[PDB]
Ligand binder design. Structure first.
Ligand SMILES: Nc1ncnc2c1ncn2[C@@H]1O[C@H](COP(=O)(O)OP(=O)(O)OP(=O)(O)O)[C@@H](O)[C@H]1O
Ligand SMILES: Nc1ncnc2c1ncn2[C@@H]1O[C@H](COP(=O)(O)OP(=O)(O)OP(=O)(O)O)[C@@H](O)[C@H]1O
Ligand SMILES: Nc1ncnc2c1ncn2[C@@H]1O[C@H](COP(=O)(O)OP(=O)(O)O)[C@@H](O)[C@H]1O
Ligand SMILES: Nc1ncnc2c1ncn2[C@@H]1O[C@H](COP(=O)(O)OP(=O)(O)O)[C@@H](O)[C@H]1O
Ligand code: MOO
Ligand SMILES: [Mg+2]
Ligand SMILES: [Mg+2]
Ligand SMILES: [Mg+2]
Ligand SMILES: [Mg+2]
Lengths: 272, 268, 268, 272, 55
């Protein structure tokens, strides 16, 4: 008289920890939810440059609205570095710093969306993106959201810096939707063998194409989250993500058409 | 005159009618939280300094709440100035900048609240009317974000797109609305000076000044937002404020006990 | 016993199956807040009277919460009747009118709560599960808005667009759901009469009546919403209500102690 | 010095319980809010059958999008029966079980909406349905919502099973909106004189057409809430509701065009 | 007759995708009267009557 009350289902009684028992029911590749969607991630450091960088990008995005169904996601930038400096000084854990940094990505999204409001573009919130993106992209050609994922105090421990940042959140969304692609808009041409703005910039060599697995094996700085490479290994749909220089007009437009104008990152999705 | 006079005017006249306005001014004055004190923890002046400034004030807050009911509002600071710089450079209006700065004050409230969580002091989307935590001797305090809720409806300044009502006005108007007995601004200087003490070393400390005397000086810079001086003269409950140096231990505690330790700015 | 047959019926039958319904009726009965009392502060009958009626009852509430756990629901009143008048003149359905009336009960809850904030009593969006204020003897009370949540899903009356479930039903169903020990309606008359005592002179007082006895009289007006009588007969926990005159000092306090000071309406 | 402060209005001073006093102001039949709307209620037990039933229904709904403006409302199904078994075992009252069962209807709505996301269809929340259905049906051709009404802890007592369930909530919305119709999508052909899947299935006879008053006089199980018949008696606009078998493709499409393919339930509405 | 029908059609536009086709009416009967008087064949009267439907 203390037995578990089960609902009859193909997964009933299972812990879901037995991968052999769950595979017949759930071991399949998922369907694409929004196969016609194009996701564009705008770097926070690009937004940090102000009107000199934002105004040309706004004009490029304006011309892209009749061409693509766009989910535009903004990164955090330098302001998240300051809340990290204050938060780490206060000793706050990584799950405390994750939502604080995400706030700066959201503010960048409001700034970018305001510049495109006359085109019908508005900032939309994470619950709206998660559940109602389809109806919002039926109302207008593009919407803006925060690229950071809502991990909050459930951010993974290990590093004192939140690992799941703007690149990672944007890819998780784009791949979960089964979007046609994700383009990362950077303040540099792409990925180099070293920081092109750091002390060893004289040794930095440009990488036109690379694997996520080879990047993950690498040590040293990257223009993308290292967690992005980890979620690329478990990707289900998106086979490549291009990092392009948003400070050069036309490269975002070219990358959305599949033209190689930056660094191509091959995910774990093996093409047929 | 009478309430029957006020009720007839309220139904027959425009709210702009001077007779209606005068009749409404005769109404009783209820103070919602008369035993509470609203304090602003500085954004650029305190929280942006990090552990060396916040941790001592956290200890002082935990000790002070044994004797004083506290509504602890947070400033914004340098991250808001960066946001204001980006948005201003794009020509965005004051209403858009207002919501950007609100996020920075939200961040500071979250950081300060997590340091006070184990003492039972919560971060509130309420504060005033958050009656339970203030009611309790074990808590007796809340933390709130100091930015006003005007958002896109922010009244712009006479010149420029910087929102004229920010975290100083946000905390002060909450103190005024709930009829609190005191409003203390906790920043990083002993009080108001004749000029900005960081950029002018010939600046002199001002122990006490009225709004009229303060306006007559024609100050180029101030430790408080200038529109707050007009809100102060219009206030019904909080007719003076105190600005203290939170970097000096004990200044907040003594100010909470009613002692004049920094600058007192009076409406009259 | 046999929860096994209940669980089998729950899986193999429609929820409309009389066999399933009977097995569910044999389930145990848990009272969520058995020691709490729900009171309705009248809208048109009390709060619309303003200070002369609300201020004495605020004092009674603050004194009564030392001995009684209170969920204080608010009526709507004359502003809702104006909203119903405008919307009905446009042919809007009861579901639309229901949302309009909720705003008025919300306003009254805000005004009442602001008078109780300094006593630690909050306005809640989830009263009978706002477990922390009701558990503390320092608070022991919450204020909530008495309109039901039906909104556009409001069941219409047999005739007309007036929502048949308003603040009487909203307060009663809260008491019933949370298994409260008592439900007291605080209005402006000694209790139920045979007709509206404000407009009928030969209306006689009814100190005690059952639902069946009341229906047999077929009254054309009542101090309580008529559908509440059917909800009361269906109730599992609150099998009687009392209606008391809040304009008489002490009536609410004595009613909370179990005294018969107004009209007791029993399900059986 | 204690008088009630009244707003002058046709209903001022009234209790609203005197029919003679309210009838001159509010006694008339209400207008229709969304007369072009078609409301479709998908049974929770239909969703419980999984892809075998959902995939053909999604294809049928997809082809209905260019033909009708659809509000799709999902029921709860077997998962609500389990939360009832656990909840009743814990002794919880009917106002506790009502929002618990409604959650399963919402989850079914999220599942169905995800399958139609590529068509611009998303799940919308109850306050959105109640206040903002017009703008969302202007943005897209259909939205999905929970059929359960938000009665919650204000559910009516009497039965330990929440009476106002998916059929009832769907009809309350449809009639309040003055919609063109409500179609109930079942896992059976319609209403029988007995449960066609129960112990008396050998005696069950199909009822092609019936009235809500006749069904309310009846004792025994039904495929629709008994409270549905009660709210049909007070209906203002909807004259008939058809229960059709969603497991037979084409019946929903036919029912939306007025074809008699299931059980027609006549409401109390006066047809001139 | 046209004004009430136009109002009904107006309220039907948000509900259906409509192809509205108009008939000819009495004016086609007159062109039949003239055309048959002139002895014109049936293939001559068909487009003449169709013109009134288009109008
Ligand atoms: N291997 C590398 N290749 C290219 N750039 C690098 C590399 N390592 C470091 N960088 C530096 O990282 C910078 C980009 O920084 P970052 O990616 O943090 O900004 P962002 O992506 O715009 O911000 P956010 O992640 O908040 O959106 C470049 O300007 C570059 O100098
Ligand atoms: N008189 C009846 N006529 C037809 N079916 C009946 C009758 N009585 C019981 N049933 C049973 O009810 C079943 C439908 O169950 P039910 O209505 O609970 O599911 P649902 O409507 O899909 O779920 P929900 O109400 O949560 O949306 C049918 O399969 C049938 O076996
Ligand atoms: N006349 C003045 N007297 C005192 N302080 C001044 C004056 N003018 C400017 N300030 C400066 O204003 C600062 C406090 O305001 P601000 O930088 O906005 O911090 P907060 O974020 O706390 O509002 C002080 O650090 C002080 O240096
Ligand atoms: N039969 C009756 N007995 C007592 N009071 C009645 C009766 N019929 C109508 N009333 C009136 O109903 C009022 C209370 O209902 P209402 O005005 O709706 O108040 P509330 O807003 O508190 O529900 C009382 O003021 C009383 O005048
Ligand atoms: O004022 Mo109400 O809406 O009848 O309770
Ligand atoms: Mg587990
Ligand atoms: Mg980057
Ligand atoms: Mg009433
Ligand atoms: Mg059914």
């Amino acid at each position: 008289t203390n037995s578990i009350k089960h609902v009859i289902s193909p997964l009933a009684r299972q812990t879901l920890q037995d991968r052999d028992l769950t595979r017949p029911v759930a071991g399949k590749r998922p369907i694409r939810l929004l196969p016609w969607l194009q996701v564009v991630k705008i770097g926070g450091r690009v937004m940090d440059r102000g009107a000199d960088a934002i105004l040309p990008l706004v004009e490029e995005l304006r011309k892209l609205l009749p061409e693509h169904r766009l989910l535009i996601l903004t990164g955090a930038g330098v302001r998240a570095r300051h809340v990290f400096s204050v938060g780490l000084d206060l000793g706050l854990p990584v799950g405390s710093l994750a939502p604080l940094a995400a706030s700066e990505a959201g503010q960048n999204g409001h700034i970018l969306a305001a510049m495109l409001a006359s085109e019908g573009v508005s900032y939309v919130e994470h619950p709206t993106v998660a559940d109602q993106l389809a109806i919002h992209l039926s109302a207008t050609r593009a919407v803006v959201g925060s690229a950071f994922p809502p991990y909050h105090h459930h951010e993974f421990p290990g590093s004192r810096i939140p690992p799941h940042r703007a690149d990672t959140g944007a890819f998780l969304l784009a791949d979960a939707f089964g979007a046609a692609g994700l383009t990362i808009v950077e303040n540099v041409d792409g990925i180099y063998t070293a920081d092109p703005n750091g002390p060893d910039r004289g040794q930095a060599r440009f990488l036109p194409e690379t694997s996520a697995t080879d990047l993950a094996k690498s040590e040293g700085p990257l223009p993308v989250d290292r967690a992005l490479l980890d979620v690329m290994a478990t990707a289900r749909h998106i086979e490549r993500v291009q990092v392009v220089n948003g400070l050069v007009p036309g490269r975002l437009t070219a990358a959305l058409r599949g033209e190689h104008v930056g660094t191509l990152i091959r995910t774990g999705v093996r093409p047929a | 005159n009478s309430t029957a006079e006020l009720e007839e005017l309220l139904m027959q006249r425009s709210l702009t009618d001077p007779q209606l306005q005068a009749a409404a001014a005769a109404a009783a004055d209820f103070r919602i939280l008369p035993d509470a004190t609203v304090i602003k923890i500085g954004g650029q002046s305190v929280i942006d300094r990090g552990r060396a400034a916040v941790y001592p004030l956290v200890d002082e807050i935990v000790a002070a709440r044994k004797n004083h009911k506290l509504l602890i509002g947070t400033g914004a600071g340098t991250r808001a100035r960066h946001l204001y710089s980006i948005a201003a450079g794009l020509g965005l209006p004051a209403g858009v900048l207002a919501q950007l700065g609100s996020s920075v004050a939200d961040q500071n409230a979250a950081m300060l609240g997590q340091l006070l969580a184990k003492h039972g002091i919560p971060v509130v989307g309420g504060a005033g009317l958050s009656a339970v935590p203030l009611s309790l001797a074990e808590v007796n305090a809340v933390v709130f974000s100091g930015m006003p809720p005007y958002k896109l409806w922010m009244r712009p300044a006479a010149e420029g797109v910087i929102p004229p009502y920010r975290t100083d006005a946000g905390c002060f108007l909450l103190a005024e609305q709930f009829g609190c007995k005191q409003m203390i601004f906790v920043k990083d200087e002993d009080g108001l000076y004749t000029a900005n003490p960081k950029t002018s070393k010939d600046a002199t400390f001002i122990p006490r000044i009225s709004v009229d005397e303060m306006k007559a000086k024609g100050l180029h810079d101030s430790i408080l937002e200038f529109p707050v001086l007009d809100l102060l003269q219009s206030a019904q409950h909080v007719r003076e404020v105190q600005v203290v140096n939170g970097l000096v231990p004990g200044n907040l505690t003594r100010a909470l006990a009613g002692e004049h330790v920094g600058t007192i700015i009076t409406a009259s």
